[PDB]
Amino acid sequence: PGAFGDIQASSLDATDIVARTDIRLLKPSVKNIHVPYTQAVSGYEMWKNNSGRPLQETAPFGCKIEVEPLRASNCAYGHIPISIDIPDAAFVRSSES
Amino acid sequence: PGAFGDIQASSLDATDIVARTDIRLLKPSVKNIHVPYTQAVSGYEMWK
Amino acid sequence: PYLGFCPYCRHSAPCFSPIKIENVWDESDDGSIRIQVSAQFGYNQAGTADVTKFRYMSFDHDHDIKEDSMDKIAISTSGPCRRLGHKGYFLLAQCPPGDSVTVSITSGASENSCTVEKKIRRKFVGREEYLFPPVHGKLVKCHVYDHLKETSAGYITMHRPGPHAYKSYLEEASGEVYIKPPSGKNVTYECKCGDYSTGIVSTRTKMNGCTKAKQCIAYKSDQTKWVFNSPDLIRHTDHSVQGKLHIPFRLTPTVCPVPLAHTPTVTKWFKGITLHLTATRPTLLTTRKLGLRADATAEWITGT
Amino acid sequence: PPGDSVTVSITSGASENSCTVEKKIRRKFVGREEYLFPPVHGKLVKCHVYDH
Amino acid sequence: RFHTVIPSPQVKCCGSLECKASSKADYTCRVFGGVYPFMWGGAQCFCDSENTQLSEAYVEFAPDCTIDHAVALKVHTAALKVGLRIVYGNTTAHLDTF
């Protein structure tokens, strides 16, 4: 409770929701009907306040983060060994060049 | 711009007013007619 | 159109009111908030569709449904709020910053108001603080409550009303207890003065073996209603899901205008830059290297 | 409500006479926890109030 | 954000109640003794004692969660795909490769 992922589910429409929010019920003291309860704050909001900057502003190597699907575009790092079969048709013999 | 004496003149009514306030015009984007711009804060206010 | 137990009525003390605020949502990016209260908006006594008037439960021993006009509804957090929409149990209004939200009906001098604590802050979209959407600026993706009253953000389950006992239905005379149902209405009564005994009466009825008024109860068989699953009511024995209302004003995506800061002045030097920055309001600056180590830095900057 | 001054006014038709005096009226609470309103559920402690 | 939904309390007027075992999210049920509650008519029951109440509460997803929600993922080895523009002599070629 009180931290990120205190309520979890496989999907928004899934009915098998599991949560631990530290909810507790207290004895009703007032004469009028009412149910009292105290509960830990939503951990989602706590993480939202303390989320920090996203990965779009922190990924190194100039990596442009994107979603749907998760990916990192235009990422500059390393060397790519390339072996290429250039066709002989484009080649021109030295006797004519 | 943004410092004391960004706008200067020899008198309040003098027409030879000289200023360098770093004002730049921006391309309009909305359909309705309006001129957008940006400009540094008044250096006189900053000194005040 | 039930009545809840508002913590803060007009005077101050908690009391039972027809306009108790149950839930408040402010997830929209334009400051609009969706409010849920016990009264039903857009309807008359029979429930017929009409924007002008709403309904509520009366403050009497018959607790029939009474009606009032839209012009007598006031929503306020710190100053008066602008009513953007209303549908059934729900309202949607744009409000200024405040620590609590209040909804009131001004029936002449009867200013019945319910207030509930809710920290409504001024929020914005983008990387720039502002009071109003600027006329000129970038167009970014935002999410705002749809003002269309027939949209659907979800659902609320309502169930059959429970027993609502009344002492006006009970009369004490010569150390004897009587039940006086309202004319033409059948009333289920039950008592315990020894052997527990229930039944239904429809006229001025004697009861035997009972000396004190606090041993019996009577209530009319009101199955002609539905009530939200509120924590301020006593539920029926068969509390099965017997209804689902929509939650209007779906939070839909759209495009919001956000300001563009004054372009910084960059002064170069050997392996380094100096950005002279001017921003009347807090503007976010985020820098990062393009090597092995990001060395990311973020800062909200004001002034020059 | 909380305010920096208190004003009392009479509005005899269009003749409005209002007297204002500086007085830092602040929101005060009883107990050990701040609250905007006295909640429905909670402890009952000793307080002192101007009799109505 | 979770919406902490609270079902309307039930009272066994002059008997007793027992906490059942439901499977809601963070389900919490308790039973309290004599309460003698008031709704609007000055009384809801006929037994000043043995007038128990059942306090019930659980949580669900907030109505506005369909937009303002966070998805938790784990990542594995990542494959790098590149689009290449390659020119030889006269001929240019665009090709996407792994």
* Residue A78, token pair as written in the block: 């390393």
Distance of CA C304 to the CA centre of its chain: 43
Distance CA D29, CA D31 (A): 7
Which helix (H) or strand (E) segment is C65 a member of?
strand C65-69
Q: Shortest Cα distance from C171 to chain E (angstroms)?
A: 13
Distance CA B5, CA B42 (A): 9
The amino acid at B15 = T
Q: Which of C263, C265, C304 sits opposite B46 (nearest CB)?
A: C304
Q: Which of B24, B36, B41 sits opposite C280 (nearest CB)?
A: B41
- Between the alpha carbon of residue D50 and those of residues C10, C116, D22, D47, E67, the distances in Å are 19, 25, 21, 10, 50
Strands C98-107 and C73-76: antiparallel
* 3-state SS string for C221-262: CCCCCCEECCCCCCECCCCCCCCEEECCCCEEEEEEEECCCC
- Between the alpha carbon of residue B39 and those of residues A5, B9, B23, C265, C266, the distances in Å are 46, 20, 4, 12, 16
* Residue C114 dihedral angles phi and psi, to the nearest 5°: -120, 130
DSSP D3-50: EEEEEEEEEETTEEEEEEEEEEE----SSSS--SS--SSS--------
Nearest chain A residue to E30, by CA: A25
At what resolution in Å was this solved? 3.4
* Residue A26, token pair as written in the block: 């207290």
Interface test with E, best of C3, C234, C244 (most E CBs within 10 A): C234
Question: Which residues in B lie closer than 8 A to residue C135 (C-beta atoms)?
Answer: 30, 34, 36
CB contact under 8 A, B29 and C136: yes
Q: Which of C233, C293, C298 sits opposite A53 (nearest CB)?
A: C298
Which helix (H) or strand (E) segment is C87 a member of?
strand C82-94
Q: Which of C136, C137, C278 sits opposite B40 (nearest CB)?
A: C278
- Against chain D, the chains showing at least 3 CB pairs within 8 Å are A, C
Q: Which of C231, C294, C298 sits opposite A60 (nearest CB)?
A: C294
Distance CA C133, CA C123 (A): 12
DSSP chain A: --STTSEE-SSTT-S--EE----EE----SSB----EE-PPPHHHHHHHT--S-GGGT-STT-EEETTTTEEES---S---------SSS---TTT-
The answer to whether C130 and C229 have CB atoms below 8 angstroms apart is no
Structural Rg of chain A based on CA atoms: 29
Q: Three-state SS for C272?
A: strand
Q: Shortest Cα distance from C142 to chain B (angstroms)?
A: 18
CB contact under 8 A, A34 and D40: yes
Residue in this structure with the two tokens 């009907």, named with its chain if needed:
A33
Q: Which of A34, A58, A59 sits opposite C232 (nearest CB)?
A: A34
**Distance separating the N- and C-terminal Cα atoms of chain D:** 18
Nearest chain B residue to C302, by CA: B41
**Distance separating the N- and C-terminal Cα atoms of chain A:** 78
Do E and C have ≥3 inter-chain CB pairs under 8 A? yes
Q: Shortest Cα distance from C233 to chain E (angstroms)?
A: 6
Question: Which residues in D lie closer than 8 A to residue C8 (C-beta atoms)?
Answer: 37
Interface test with C, best of E40, E50, E56, E69 (most C CBs within 10 A): E40
Distance CA C8, CA C17 (A): 10
* Residue B11, token pair as written in the block: 């008198």
Count CB-CB contacts under 10 A for residue D45.
Answer: 8
- Between the alpha carbon of residue C143 and those of residues A50, C82, C247, E66, the distances in Å are 21, 20, 17, 11
The answer to whether E35 and E47 have CB atoms below 8 angstroms apart is no
Q: Shortest Cα distance from C141 to chain B (angstroms)?
A: 17
Q: How was this structure determined?
A: cryo-EM
Question: Which residues in C lie closer than 8 A to residue E62 (C-beta atoms)?
Answer: 25, 27
E strands, B1-48, are: 7-8, 18-19, 23-25, 37-39
Q: Minimal CA–CA distance to C114: which of C232, C251, C248, C236?
A: C232
Question: In this complex, how many residue pairs, one in chain A and one in chain C, have their CB atoms less than 8 Å apart?
Answer: 36
* Interchain CB contact of D49 with C (< 8 Å): no
Distance CA C105, CA C83 (A): 14
DSSP C11: S
Distance CA A44, CA E64 (A): 14
Interface test with D, best of C11, C15, C117, C118 (most D CBs within 10 A): C117
- Between the alpha carbon of residue A70 and those of residues A22, A64, A73, C50, E78, the distances in Å are 34, 11, 10, 48, 11
